[PDB]
């Protein structure tokens, strides 16, 4: 009768929503089962199992240090055991691990199971476009939504106020109240006083913003680094928002314009990304120094990557196979500056209408 | 036959817009008359006349120093002489001088004259709402549009790339091509490679943004100063944008939602204002110190004011007479914090949906 929730991922973002979910399961005992399972890929810190470190003193010592986890958030090293007659699966693993997790879950989940994908962005390249939520559905046979917004795992964990959008299309095989998941169940599952949740249907809209915003953030960084200021940056954000809407309606049609300017996953996530982050910082240094993206990527983010560098190439490849490159001058301009040696100062002329 | 253009202004924005217009008049000799007149309220410098300082060596030494003005930008101390059968009037003076300029132009303009107001914002209070372009139309009997975007006179003058929206409803009195002004004439009049122009109809939409953005910028400052970061700020911008749309469509129902998220006057102007400026800076200090607004206004802005402080009171008064206070929780929250002594930390609970 009540909904059993499992989180598949355990990382930064994985541990953090699993806490969000565990706090709501305790908060609504008539709706959700008391215990929340979290799939942790077994690792040993100082010869001690990570799964047991979490199952008292309640801290993900490696991926989320200093954050006290509820009591009902139980770590599980077995993927199939964590899924043992689950109702709601919250997918929170890096994109490169999705094919592994899906192949391992095939024939072990359940037709009744409904899922939510916390994986930001979508699949884009020369061969086509695909939502990661749709990959889950066609490799598991389960209904799958998305969670995305202007948020960072570190801030949500420290209970710093931010928002998120949760998108889910109610399926045909729905049977209502205390039996299946609707927008009320999803609102109760994720909403916290420090984490405002808006529940919608548009899974496509929420998803494309998560990737495309990073291409726009590069254009803002270029413009900031050149010393053009806030007004020039705000102009790229406006042009960028328009290109995100255009991309969504062209390839997912399907998608509501409203999602892009009304939701956290849209406009708010674009604003925060263009204000500060990996993509804007790398682009700003490219303009300051004159070094190429990857030189700047190495210098500032050491380990990690500015995902917009990959996205602008992938979007370009998809648009070349569509014959729709002319329709997105900002996306094209960012690609031309990053990969080829386009002047950067020519950005206004390239986007000029 | 060609369009004679006059700018009523001479200040920061006035001289800058007159430079933009003079550049385009020289650029389109088949559309506009060669000379552009600029009304300058006579003042003496080195005991010298400001009007003659501009009419060679072409510099507004007091209001726009270091900026070389074309050749065809002629300063005029006589209001009526500057309007000497003129086709297009560009109003660019501070809000407090609009009743003076209008009362002095009454019975001296000409019915065929079309105008553009560069005066940001609109009139709001307990008694009602009014566009300042509508005040011009009701006092002069001339059609009047608006010019607003994410821009600063200083940057546009320096030819630093930015954008603007120009809004104008084509009237019933319209003739067509080389006889009257349409969106093509307005695009040619204001568009520059360093100043991108988008021409629309929605005069109401672009006007309300110019005032309301400062109420939102206060909410961002509060949230930043509390140490909640970019994600919390982006959330207030998202909520704020929604409240600007809601306000526009409630009180100027002929307003298009599109204007708010597609145009420079909308989303871009909101982004730049919330990123940096008087309103965000004062609000940030209010959170940092704990002093009241005006104590913070004196400490940073010296001989300048954060308009949003007045606007949040004026909007509240209008909403009280409408009985629509509940519909705008963010606008109400900003008010309550500024005027009364509302905790500021309660901002998420006040806007919670």
From Swiss-Prot, chains A, B:
Effect of residue 224 to V: In strain: WFB
Enzyme Commission number(s) from the entry: 1.1.1.8
Chief place where the protein resides: cytoplasm
Enzyme superclass (EC): oxidoreductase
Keyword Ribosomal protein carried by entry: no
Residue positions binding substrate: 120, 278-279
Binding-site residues, NAD(+): 9-14, 41, 97, 153, 278, 307
Recorded GO CC terms: cytosol; mitochondrion; nucleus; peroxisome
Mutation effect (residue 111 to A): In strain: WFB
One BP term from GO: protein import into peroxisome matrix
A Pfam family hit: NAD_Gly3P_dh_N
Subcellular location: Cytoplasm; Peroxisome
Keyword Repeat: no
Effect upon mutating residue 193 to S: In strain: WFB
PROSITE patterns per the UniProt record, alphabetical: NAD_G3PDH (PS00957)
Function, in words: Catalyzes the production and accumulation of glycerol during hyperosmotic stress conditions. Glycerol acts as an osmoregulator that prevents loss of water and turgor of the cells.
Miscellaneous section: Present with 807 molecules/cell in log phase SD medium.
Alphabetized PANTHER family for the sequence: GLYCEROL-3-PHOSPHATE DEHYDROGENASE, GLYCEROL-3-PHOSPHATE DEHYDROGENASE [NAD(+)]-RELATED
Family to which this protein belongs: Belongs to the NAD-dependent glycerol-3-phosphate dehydrogenase family.
Protein's UniProt name: Glycerol-3-phosphate dehydrogenase [NAD(+)] 1
Primary gene name: GPD1
